[PDB]
Amino acid sequence: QPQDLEFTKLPNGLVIASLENYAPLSRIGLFVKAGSRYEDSNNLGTSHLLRLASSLTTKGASSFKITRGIEAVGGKLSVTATRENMAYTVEGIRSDIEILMEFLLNVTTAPEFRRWEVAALRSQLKIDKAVAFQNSQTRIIENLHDVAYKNALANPLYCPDYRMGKITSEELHYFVQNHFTSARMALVGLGVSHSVLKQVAEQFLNMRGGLGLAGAKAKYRGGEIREQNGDNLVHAAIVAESAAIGNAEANAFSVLQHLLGAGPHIKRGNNTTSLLSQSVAKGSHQPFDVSAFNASYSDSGLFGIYTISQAAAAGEVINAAYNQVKAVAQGNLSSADVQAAKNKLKAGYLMSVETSEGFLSEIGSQALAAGSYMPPSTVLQQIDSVADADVVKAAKKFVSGKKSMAASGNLGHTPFLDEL
Amino acid sequence: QPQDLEFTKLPNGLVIASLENYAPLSRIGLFVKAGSRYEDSNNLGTSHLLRLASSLTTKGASSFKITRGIEAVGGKLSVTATRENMAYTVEGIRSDIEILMEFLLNVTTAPEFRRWEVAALRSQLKIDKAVAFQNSQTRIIENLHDVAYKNALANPLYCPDYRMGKITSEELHYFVQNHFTSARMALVGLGVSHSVLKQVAEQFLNMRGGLGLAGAKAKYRGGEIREQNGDNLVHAAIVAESAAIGNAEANAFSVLQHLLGAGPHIKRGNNTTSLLSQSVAKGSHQPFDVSAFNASYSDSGLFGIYTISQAAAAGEVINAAYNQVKAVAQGNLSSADVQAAKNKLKAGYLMSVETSEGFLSEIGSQALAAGSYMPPSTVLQQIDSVADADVVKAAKKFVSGKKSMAASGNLGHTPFLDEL
Amino acid sequence: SSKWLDGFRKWYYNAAGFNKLGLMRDDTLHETEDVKEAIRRLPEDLYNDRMFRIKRALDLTMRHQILPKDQWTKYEEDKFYLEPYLKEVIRERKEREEWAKK
Amino acid sequence: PLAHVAIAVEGPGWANPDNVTLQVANAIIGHYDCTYGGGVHLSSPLASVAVANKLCQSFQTFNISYSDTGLLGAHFVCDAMSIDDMVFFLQGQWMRLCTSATESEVTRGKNILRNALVSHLDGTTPVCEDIGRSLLTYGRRIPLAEWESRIQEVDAQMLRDICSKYFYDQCPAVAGYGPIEQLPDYNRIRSGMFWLRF
Amino acid sequence: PLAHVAIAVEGPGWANPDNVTLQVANAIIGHYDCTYGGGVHLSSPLASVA
Amino acid sequence: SHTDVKVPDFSDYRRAEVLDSTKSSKESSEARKGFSYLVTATTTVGVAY
Amino acid sequence: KNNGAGYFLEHLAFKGTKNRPGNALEKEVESIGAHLNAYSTREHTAYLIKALSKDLPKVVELLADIVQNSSLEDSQIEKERDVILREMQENDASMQNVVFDYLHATAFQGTPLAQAVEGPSENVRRLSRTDLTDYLNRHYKAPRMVLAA
Amino acid sequence: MYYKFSSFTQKLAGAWASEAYTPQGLKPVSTEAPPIIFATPTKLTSSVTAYDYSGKN
Amino acid sequence: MLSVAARSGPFAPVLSATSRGVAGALRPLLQGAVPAASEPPVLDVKRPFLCRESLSGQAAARPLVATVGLNVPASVRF
């Protein structure tokens, strides 16, 4: 009864994928390869300001009209961004969602970017960065990606403190005209038909070239950053280079992630089938949390160990986790552990694609990455093809690589990269 | 004409140096080995507050009495802190100086360290850090020190921003009672008789006879820091491990920095006899400033190049300077250049002790290190006893060592440490 | 409209008398919320030129003087710098008012 | 972000002895910036007032001499909201030196001037500068013992007579740069240069 | 650093259908956070004045 | 530059004894303020009457 | 009309003489490790050298041609005109110097003591070698010079 | 490195090497000299205070 | 040749810091003044972690994804 998702590749490169849910509510997204990946040092923090400035005036709809008309029908407008790509989403009732797309396409296609409004929401940039940096995992991953790469992936999600007050509307216009092109977009619809989506793509979307600007290939750097800030807990991420999205080894790295532990399956549990948690639990007697970090991108990936530990116990926690990974890389693991890891991974995927937000995010990600949507059963089938030898190869890939380290807290007894 | 300098080693380890020259005003300084070397991760910035605690209440004098009594005789109290030692210097007209001495005595022996006064002083240390980091050389040198060393010299001269509002009186009392001991201090008087200094030292320098807490043992790590601030100029310091003070290799490294160019000699000059400036001026047709950095401590040393260049032409300047050091590391140099480097070094040393402040600072550091006078002629002949192969092997020890890099500015064209 | 209305506009521009204080037309507009928002939306160059012209006019009207006749603002060279900003502010205020009607 | 204001009057020049007295007057008012570590206990009244009320970022007095002319006055940098208050305070200090200078204040200024004159000539560069400038201006090298003899002549009565001669009821020259609309007009600055109570 | 204040009155519970009516009343006033996107143009007059 | 700022000539409004720039001031300043304070003193005497 | 002549000679004084053409002169003082400095006020100009006492003769010889044998070349005039424009742009940022110049101008209106030492920008753009020669022939005579040591 | 003439007292004070011996900055090109316009046409004469007369000579 | 600050020629005042508790007769050149800078925004008190049960799940495992909205709060998920 959820019949089939239909897929369409227009000759200008634009992707349209839609599914006829016959749902009470419709969700329509536009996925653009316009992340923080596509900034050089001249225009840092432009994507953050564009993400915040989606709700400004457009050549065809004013910001009062956009805000009041979205709130008048009860719909939602959201922008979700990562380093690689941005996504615009409207949510509404089926009878209204048509005119909702009108608002969305204005936000994508004809932004006026008036100077006074940009000058108004630079303060919103400062507030949003403060709120997002209230969590320490944010600044750990930001410094980790800054140190781990030389160019095009060391650029932050959040605008640096010097570029605030220095971003003009001309830079946003340049970013739109160079990255919001036709062959970098996927228009995804849930609760709609193909005809209306093809009509609105023919109306608003079919004017730009399509190739745009490529980027700078994300050369690996390595090194470490240590930020002494005086908290109760010390955060430390140690990563190394790993395979990208679409490589045959990304599945093995995800299996190794769920084998080493990537989240508590039981609330207030003890993480029995997590190897890193087992090693640090038999080691220490203080509060801690250790997990495996995976982050695969279009042409690169990072795999490593994340540790939150006490200030005077960080060295033994980090060394226990690292020696656990070193013991995994020598082949000391059981087949039932790999089977439970595959179960954890495919369970996480299937419970990630259940809601409409996660489903539409996965459709847009697949359309932007591969250009060909695959069913979840095919994803589970290629998960099932991972052998344990490829997991041991992934662990040896982590062990025999140049590590990148990011640490924060009281670093009195936190070790260094050569000391590991 | 004065008589020669007079020394006394008291049984509690206090060194006393005095020069009787019948100066119109006299200079009294106490030199303590209590810099920022001796902190750890828990009491960072204690030396910065202790530097500004020189006008607080002691026993025997209040803040009002100290300030009004030093300003009433026209005298001056200052304190200069390096990363290894501090120096408390009072000066004033001769007929008053004894009362000035007891003021310095109180500031160096029995501080009260009340809580309300240090709570008032922490805002002043924030303001002082802002004034100090207004220029870019200070910021990049403190970053370079934080990257080059992992302990005991990564502690900056100025208090970290998280520690402000958190330094209590107990940390100051602990620091004074563990580092302001009589076996680590030198009392030096220019323009005062030896009996006056010996009488004051026998009066109130008989409380802390131990050697204090010592043995921090700074270690070298290397790496790089890259502060993107988007300025038009790019600063970059690239250093490496070099010999400490107490060696002929330290003389070789000083001859090496004056051979490569160690600052200007001519107002609006071109630095023609500087090798680095010659190479970069042959390369670049834009303004620049290349010099040689040499920070020698008692346990380790940093030697490298410091470059200021334009934002886009930074790579050419940095690579030309590094290739110039590489070329002079392979024996390609002339002995007339080494003789001019020796003349520059000895002229700078004789101009340093030309004023009374440089002479008192030099004899305070000599009394702290060896406890005995090194006459300037012995320093000149030790400069003269340096061969060319020593400078060649010093540059070879620089080029073969792992570098510490600190960069600041628009680093789009600035290279990384793998590309030197 | 062709022959003398432009001529009567030139004569009225001379007769009103803000040109002999160096002012443009849009400098003479009395502030409202709309005019203050339109002034706030101006770029820095036109804002600084406007404020210098205004305080020059206040200096001249202090001493009961006028500019020399060659420094009078010409009728054709008089630019209407503010009125697109003012028209945009008026248009968005009218949009807000008609939304508040329904 | 900050505003600099310099106020001045005439000073007599190089070859008039009461310059020494005027130097003592500057030593009474002195200099301050935000990194001075005295607190609320500085001897200069203007410095203690500006610390307590949080007015200044820095102030600095000067005496500048050319051939039978010069500029004598003060220069301060502060934020906008402080400017007017400090001008009042600064002018009040001058009027105090015109009317009610005491003896310990003059003694402190004399000791400050002794230390400034001796400790400025430390090293061969400022000594050589003093030699060349003294042969060009005074026609001779004034020895430091002659300076000490002229400083010892200064007491409170002749100091407030000289300060009334050079400051009281005189038209200043005011220069300003920055956010300076709280800096008053010339009439209020000129009216602040005299007391209605004398 | 900053204060949390809650004001409530007695409401009916589950079984009373006018609860649904009360929900619409809350949907007129709604919510506001400092990290929103609409700005002054939100329809809620409390959020707009806040 | 800031050195391009030059004060314009004020010689039309300027008083008579301060006209030439080659003559020192503080020679007739007392006469100028004596005239202005005499104007103020005569005004105060009249309003006191 | 020669309002920046002393400043522009103060720039070109270290750029070469008749017997020491260009940077070789500069090389000479660096070859003895000495420090060479200058300043120019509204009334006085100074060229001073810190050196060692043991090289007292050579430095005096250098000082000699610096005050009487300066080779004023056209290319050096062009590039030092650009350097002077650069540091008037730099000294515009030093805001207390700006208020210093403003105070001198407004206090000494109509007199030669109002003009700055570096002068206006147009005089930097237009000044010629003959004007500098007239300034140095008029004001660099021996009765007005003090050799201080 | 050692002495720069400054400090409002006309004295050779002590200053850092980057400003005592390099007074011109590292900025490459001078940008502009913005001209001064006045309200009225003023006779901003530097020498001899414009003219002194009272009629036609 | 001691006096580690004077070992470095131009890098004497950068390696050292010279406060003045009682400022003397001669003023230092370049007095210096902080500009009136801005202030950081205020935020509520966060959640401390004092037990192993609260710390579970806090270790990051996925790349950082930020989300803003017109009337939904801004969030970051790892």
PDB file of N, CA, C and O in Angstrom, chain A residues 51 71 77-82 126 134 137-138 141 158 257 264 288-289 291-294 297 306 308, chain I residues 41 43-44 46 49 52-53 55-70 74 76 78:
ATOM      1  N   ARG A  51      22.084  29.547   6.043  1.00  0.00           N
ATOM      2  CA  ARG A  51      21.201  28.683   6.819  1.00  0.00           C
ATOM      3  C   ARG A  51      20.309  29.483   7.755  1.00  0.00           C
ATOM      4  O   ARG A  51      19.116  29.191   7.888  1.00  0.00           O
ATOM      5  N   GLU A  71       3.206  30.184   9.148  1.00  0.00           N
ATOM      6  CA  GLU A  71       2.521  29.989  10.420  1.00  0.00           C
ATOM      7  C   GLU A  71       1.003  30.028  10.299  1.00  0.00           C
ATOM      8  O   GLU A  71       0.319  29.602  11.234  1.00  0.00           O
ATOM      9  N   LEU A  77       8.946  25.025   8.443  1.00  0.00           N
ATOM     10  CA  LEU A  77      10.066  25.219   7.533  1.00  0.00           C
ATOM     11  C   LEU A  77      11.347  25.015   8.323  1.00  0.00           C
ATOM     12  O   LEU A  77      11.559  25.676   9.344  1.00  0.00           O
ATOM     13  N   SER A  78      12.192  24.102   7.858  1.00  0.00           N
ATOM     14  CA  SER A  78      13.426  23.777   8.555  1.00  0.00           C
ATOM     15  C   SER A  78      14.577  23.693   7.567  1.00  0.00           C
ATOM     16  O   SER A  78      14.391  23.361   6.395  1.00  0.00           O
ATOM     17  N   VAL A  79      15.770  24.018   8.049  1.00  0.00           N
ATOM     18  CA  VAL A  79      16.998  23.882   7.281  1.00  0.00           C
ATOM     19  C   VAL A  79      17.947  23.017   8.092  1.00  0.00           C
ATOM     20  O   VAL A  79      18.240  23.329   9.251  1.00  0.00           O
ATOM     21  N   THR A  80      18.425  21.936   7.486  1.00  0.00           N
ATOM     22  CA  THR A  80      19.326  20.991   8.129  1.00  0.00           C
ATOM     23  C   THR A  80      20.625  20.962   7.342  1.00  0.00           C
ATOM     24  O   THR A  80      20.613  20.718   6.133  1.00  0.00           O
ATOM     25  N   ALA A  81      21.743  21.204   8.019  1.00  0.00           N
ATOM     26  CA  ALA A  81      23.021  21.328   7.340  1.00  0.00           C
ATOM     27  C   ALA A  81      24.073  20.441   7.980  1.00  0.00           C
ATOM     28  O   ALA A  81      24.086  20.231   9.194  1.00  0.00           O
ATOM     29  N   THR A  82      24.960  19.931   7.133  1.00  0.00           N
ATOM     30  CA  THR A  82      26.178  19.258   7.554  1.00  0.00           C
ATOM     31  C   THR A  82      27.347  19.882   6.801  1.00  0.00           C
ATOM     32  O   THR A  82      27.176  20.924   6.163  1.00  0.00           O
ATOM     33  N   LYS A 126      25.816  34.988  16.077  1.00  0.00           N
ATOM     34  CA  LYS A 126      26.559  34.913  17.340  1.00  0.00           C
ATOM     35  C   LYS A 126      25.801  34.110  18.400  1.00  0.00           C
ATOM     36  O   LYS A 126      26.383  33.242  19.073  1.00  0.00           O
ATOM     37  N   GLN A 134      27.388  25.439  23.515  1.00  0.00           N
ATOM     38  CA  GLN A 134      27.124  25.068  24.903  1.00  0.00           C
ATOM     39  C   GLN A 134      27.367  23.585  25.174  1.00  0.00           C
ATOM     40  O   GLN A 134      27.595  23.210  26.327  1.00  0.00           O
ATOM     41  N   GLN A 137      30.725  18.399  22.924  1.00  0.00           N
ATOM     42  CA  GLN A 137      30.931  17.516  21.780  1.00  0.00           C
ATOM     43  C   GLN A 137      30.993  18.294  20.477  1.00  0.00           C
ATOM     44  O   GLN A 137      31.712  17.893  19.551  1.00  0.00           O
ATOM     45  N   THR A 138      30.269  19.417  20.407  1.00  0.00           N
ATOM     46  CA  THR A 138      30.303  20.280  19.232  1.00  0.00           C
ATOM     47  C   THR A 138      31.702  20.820  18.984  1.00  0.00           C
ATOM     48  O   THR A 138      32.246  20.663  17.887  1.00  0.00           O
ATOM     49  N   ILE A 141      34.248  17.993  18.014  1.00  0.00           N
ATOM     50  CA  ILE A 141      34.180  17.550  16.621  1.00  0.00           C
ATOM     51  C   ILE A 141      34.604  18.668  15.666  1.00  0.00           C
ATOM     52  O   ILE A 141      35.233  18.403  14.632  1.00  0.00           O
ATOM     53  N   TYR A 158      30.117  26.313  12.061  1.00  0.00           N
ATOM     54  CA  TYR A 158      29.756  27.549  12.727  1.00  0.00           C
ATOM     55  C   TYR A 158      30.780  28.626  12.418  1.00  0.00           C
ATOM     56  O   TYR A 158      31.981  28.354  12.349  1.00  0.00           O
ATOM     57  N   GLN A 257      32.389   0.018  14.081  1.00  0.00           N
ATOM     58  CA  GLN A 257      31.807   1.005  14.990  1.00  0.00           C
ATOM     59  C   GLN A 257      30.812   0.371  15.944  1.00  0.00           C
ATOM     60  O   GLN A 257      30.891   0.571  17.160  1.00  0.00           O
ATOM     61  N   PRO A 264      24.150   3.386  23.875  1.00  0.00           N
ATOM     62  CA  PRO A 264      23.552   2.480  24.866  1.00  0.00           C
ATOM     63  C   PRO A 264      22.227   1.935  24.358  1.00  0.00           C
ATOM     64  O   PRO A 264      21.298   2.693  24.074  1.00  0.00           O
ATOM     65  N   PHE A 288      32.450   7.618  33.259  1.00  0.00           N
ATOM     66  CA  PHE A 288      33.107   7.672  31.959  1.00  0.00           C
ATOM     67  C   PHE A 288      32.080   7.341  30.887  1.00  0.00           C
ATOM     68  O   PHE A 288      30.972   6.888  31.179  1.00  0.00           O
ATOM     69  N   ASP A 289      32.484   7.549  29.634  1.00  0.00           N
ATOM     70  CA  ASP A 289      31.727   7.071  28.477  1.00  0.00           C
ATOM     71  C   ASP A 289      32.665   6.995  27.288  1.00  0.00           C
ATOM     72  O   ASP A 289      33.233   8.012  26.887  1.00  0.00           O
ATOM     73  N   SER A 291      33.110   5.490  23.224  1.00  0.00           N
ATOM     74  CA  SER A 291      32.393   5.000  22.058  1.00  0.00           C
ATOM     75  C   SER A 291      33.296   5.088  20.841  1.00  0.00           C
ATOM     76  O   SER A 291      34.402   5.629  20.894  1.00  0.00           O
ATOM     77  N   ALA A 292      32.803   4.549  19.734  1.00  0.00           N
ATOM     78  CA  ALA A 292      33.510   4.568  18.465  1.00  0.00           C
ATOM     79  C   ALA A 292      32.869   5.604  17.558  1.00  0.00           C
ATOM     80  O   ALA A 292      31.643   5.642  17.420  1.00  0.00           O
ATOM     81  N   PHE A 293      33.701   6.442  16.954  1.00  0.00           N
ATOM     82  CA  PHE A 293      33.269   7.552  16.120  1.00  0.00           C
ATOM     83  C   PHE A 293      33.492   7.187  14.661  1.00  0.00           C
ATOM     84  O   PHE A 293      34.597   6.791  14.282  1.00  0.00           O
ATOM     85  N   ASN A 294      32.448   7.315  13.851  1.00  0.00           N
ATOM     86  CA  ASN A 294      32.550   7.130  12.413  1.00  0.00           C
ATOM     87  C   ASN A 294      31.937   8.338  11.731  1.00  0.00           C
ATOM     88  O   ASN A 294      30.880   8.816  12.150  1.00  0.00           O
ATOM     89  N   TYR A 297      32.373  10.744   4.458  1.00  0.00           N
ATOM     90  CA  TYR A 297      31.983  11.830   3.575  1.00  0.00           C
ATOM     91  C   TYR A 297      32.096  11.363   2.128  1.00  0.00           C
ATOM     92  O   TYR A 297      32.237  10.168   1.853  1.00  0.00           O
ATOM     93  N   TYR A 306      36.101   8.002  20.800  1.00  0.00           N
ATOM     94  CA  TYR A 306      35.689   9.142  21.605  1.00  0.00           C
ATOM     95  C   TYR A 306      35.638   8.715  23.063  1.00  0.00           C
ATOM     96  O   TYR A 306      35.058   7.674  23.387  1.00  0.00           O
ATOM     97  N   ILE A 308      34.980  10.281  27.082  1.00  0.00           N
ATOM     98  CA  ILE A 308      34.703  11.255  28.126  1.00  0.00           C
ATOM     99  C   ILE A 308      35.109  10.606  29.435  1.00  0.00           C
ATOM    100  O   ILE A 308      34.602   9.533  29.781  1.00  0.00           O
TER     101      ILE A 308
ATOM    102  N   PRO I  41      26.741  36.467  24.940  1.00  0.00           N
ATOM    103  CA  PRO I  41      25.352  36.273  25.363  1.00  0.00           C
ATOM    104  C   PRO I  41      25.262  35.363  26.573  1.00  0.00           C
ATOM    105  O   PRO I  41      26.127  34.520  26.816  1.00  0.00           O
ATOM    106  N   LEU I  43      23.614  32.405  28.890  1.00  0.00           N
ATOM    107  CA  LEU I  43      23.012  31.099  28.692  1.00  0.00           C
ATOM    108  C   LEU I  43      22.676  30.493  30.043  1.00  0.00           C
ATOM    109  O   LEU I  43      23.279  30.835  31.063  1.00  0.00           O
ATOM    110  N   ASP I  44      21.699  29.592  30.038  1.00  0.00           N
ATOM    111  CA  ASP I  44      21.281  28.932  31.263  1.00  0.00           C
ATOM    112  C   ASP I  44      22.333  27.941  31.755  1.00  0.00           C
ATOM    113  O   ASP I  44      23.263  27.566  31.034  1.00  0.00           O
ATOM    114  N   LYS I  46      23.882  24.490  32.594  1.00  0.00           N
ATOM    115  CA  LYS I  46      23.808  23.291  31.780  1.00  0.00           C
ATOM    116  C   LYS I  46      23.609  22.066  32.670  1.00  0.00           C
ATOM    117  O   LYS I  46      23.349  22.175  33.871  1.00  0.00           O
ATOM    118  N   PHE I  49      27.344  16.089  34.750  1.00  0.00           N
ATOM    119  CA  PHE I  49      27.308  14.633  34.699  1.00  0.00           C
ATOM    120  C   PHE I  49      28.104  14.104  35.882  1.00  0.00           C
ATOM    121  O   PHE I  49      29.333  14.221  35.913  1.00  0.00           O
ATOM    122  N   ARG I  52      27.774   7.490  36.079  1.00  0.00           N
ATOM    123  CA  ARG I  52      27.966   6.737  34.846  1.00  0.00           C
ATOM    124  C   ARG I  52      26.669   6.598  34.062  1.00  0.00           C
ATOM    125  O   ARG I  52      26.695   6.509  32.829  1.00  0.00           O
ATOM    126  N   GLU I  53      25.530   6.590  34.754  1.00  0.00           N
ATOM    127  CA  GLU I  53      24.249   6.393  34.087  1.00  0.00           C
ATOM    128  C   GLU I  53      23.848   7.605  33.258  1.00  0.00           C
ATOM    129  O   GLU I  53      23.222   7.451  32.205  1.00  0.00           O
ATOM    130  N   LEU I  55      26.117   9.773  31.946  1.00  0.00           N
ATOM    131  CA  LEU I  55      27.125   9.962  30.912  1.00  0.00           C
ATOM    132  C   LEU I  55      26.949   9.040  29.716  1.00  0.00           C
ATOM    133  O   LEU I  55      27.585   9.284  28.688  1.00  0.00           O
ATOM    134  N   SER I  56      26.131   7.995  29.822  1.00  0.00           N
ATOM    135  CA  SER I  56      25.980   7.043  28.729  1.00  0.00           C
ATOM    136  C   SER I  56      25.251   7.683  27.555  1.00  0.00           C
ATOM    137  O   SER I  56      24.202   8.309  27.724  1.00  0.00           O
ATOM    138  N   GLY I  57      25.819   7.526  26.362  1.00  0.00           N
ATOM    139  CA  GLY I  57      25.295   8.138  25.166  1.00  0.00           C
ATOM    140  C   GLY I  57      25.861   9.499  24.854  1.00  0.00           C
ATOM    141  O   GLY I  57      25.619  10.015  23.757  1.00  0.00           O
ATOM    142  N   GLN I  58      26.609  10.097  25.777  1.00  0.00           N
ATOM    143  CA  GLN I  58      27.170  11.418  25.548  1.00  0.00           C
ATOM    144  C   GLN I  58      28.382  11.393  24.633  1.00  0.00           C
ATOM    145  O   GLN I  58      28.713  12.426  24.046  1.00  0.00           O
ATOM    146  N   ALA I  59      29.051  10.253  24.501  1.00  0.00           N
ATOM    147  CA  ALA I  59      30.187  10.160  23.596  1.00  0.00           C
ATOM    148  C   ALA I  59      29.702  10.156  22.153  1.00  0.00           C
ATOM    149  O   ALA I  59      28.784   9.412  21.798  1.00  0.00           O
ATOM    150  N   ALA I  60      30.316  10.996  21.327  1.00  0.00           N
ATOM    151  CA  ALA I  60      29.880  11.158  19.949  1.00  0.00           C
ATOM    152  C   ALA I  60      30.251   9.945  19.108  1.00  0.00           C
ATOM    153  O   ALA I  60      31.281   9.304  19.319  1.00  0.00           O
ATOM    154  N   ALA I  61      29.386   9.626  18.147  1.00  0.00           N
ATOM    155  CA  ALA I  61      29.605   8.496  17.255  1.00  0.00           C
ATOM    156  C   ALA I  61      29.340   8.794  15.789  1.00  0.00           C
ATOM    157  O   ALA I  61      29.791   8.021  14.937  1.00  0.00           O
ATOM    158  N   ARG I  62      28.634   9.866  15.465  1.00  0.00           N
ATOM    159  CA  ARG I  62      28.226  10.217  14.115  1.00  0.00           C
ATOM    160  C   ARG I  62      28.660  11.651  13.850  1.00  0.00           C
ATOM    161  O   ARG I  62      28.945  12.395  14.794  1.00  0.00           O
ATOM    162  N   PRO I  63      28.776  12.058  12.581  1.00  0.00           N
ATOM    163  CA  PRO I  63      29.169  13.442  12.290  1.00  0.00           C
ATOM    164  C   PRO I  63      28.120  14.458  12.716  1.00  0.00           C
ATOM    165  O   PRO I  63      26.931  14.164  12.845  1.00  0.00           O
ATOM    166  N   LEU I  64      28.601  15.677  12.930  1.00  0.00           N
ATOM    167  CA  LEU I  64      27.806  16.752  13.505  1.00  0.00           C
ATOM    168  C   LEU I  64      26.820  17.290  12.476  1.00  0.00           C
ATOM    169  O   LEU I  64      27.212  17.677  11.372  1.00  0.00           O
ATOM    170  N   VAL I  65      25.540  17.320  12.838  1.00  0.00           N
ATOM    171  CA  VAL I  65      24.488  17.799  11.949  1.00  0.00           C
ATOM    172  C   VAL I  65      23.686  18.861  12.689  1.00  0.00           C
ATOM    173  O   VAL I  65      23.115  18.582  13.750  1.00  0.00           O
ATOM    174  N   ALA I  66      23.634  20.068  12.131  1.00  0.00           N
ATOM    175  CA  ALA I  66      22.930  21.191  12.730  1.00  0.00           C
ATOM    176  C   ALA I  66      21.603  21.424  12.023  1.00  0.00           C
ATOM    177  O   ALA I  66      21.457  21.133  10.834  1.00  0.00           O
ATOM    178  N   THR I  67      20.635  21.961  12.763  1.00  0.00           N
ATOM    179  CA  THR I  67      19.303  22.184  12.220  1.00  0.00           C
ATOM    180  C   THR I  67      18.722  23.452  12.822  1.00  0.00           C
ATOM    181  O   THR I  67      18.656  23.582  14.047  1.00  0.00           O
ATOM    182  N   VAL I  68      18.314  24.379  11.963  1.00  0.00           N
ATOM    183  CA  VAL I  68      17.604  25.575  12.382  1.00  0.00           C
ATOM    184  C   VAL I  68      16.177  25.497  11.853  1.00  0.00           C
ATOM    185  O   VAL I  68      15.838  24.642  11.038  1.00  0.00           O
ATOM    186  N   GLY I  69      15.332  26.403  12.332  1.00  0.00           N
ATOM    187  CA  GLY I  69      13.951  26.418  11.891  1.00  0.00           C
ATOM    188  C   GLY I  69      13.304  27.755  12.165  1.00  0.00           C
ATOM    189  O   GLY I  69      13.825  28.587  12.910  1.00  0.00           O
ATOM    190  N   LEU I  70      12.146  27.952  11.535  1.00  0.00           N
ATOM    191  CA  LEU I  70      11.413  29.201  11.696  1.00  0.00           C
ATOM    192  C   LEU I  70      10.729  29.275  13.057  1.00  0.00           C
ATOM    193  O   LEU I  70      10.750  30.323  13.709  1.00  0.00           O
ATOM    194  N   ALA I  74      16.573  25.563  17.495  1.00  0.00           N
ATOM    195  CA  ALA I  74      17.777  25.087  16.832  1.00  0.00           C
ATOM    196  C   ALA I  74      18.379  23.931  17.612  1.00  0.00           C
ATOM    197  O   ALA I  74      18.397  23.934  18.845  1.00  0.00           O
ATOM    198  N   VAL I  76      21.479  20.540  17.511  1.00  0.00           N
ATOM    199  CA  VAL I  76      22.625  19.862  16.925  1.00  0.00           C
ATOM    200  C   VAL I  76      22.590  18.407  17.379  1.00  0.00           C
ATOM    201  O   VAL I  76      22.294  18.114  18.543  1.00  0.00           O
ATOM    202  N   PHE I  78      24.542  14.475  16.937  1.00  0.00           N
ATOM    203  CA  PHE I  78      25.829  13.881  16.650  1.00  0.00           C
ATOM    204  C   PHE I  78      25.618  12.455  16.183  1.00  0.00           C
ATOM    205  O   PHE I  78      24.672  11.789  16.603  1.00  0.00           O
TER     206      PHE I  78
END
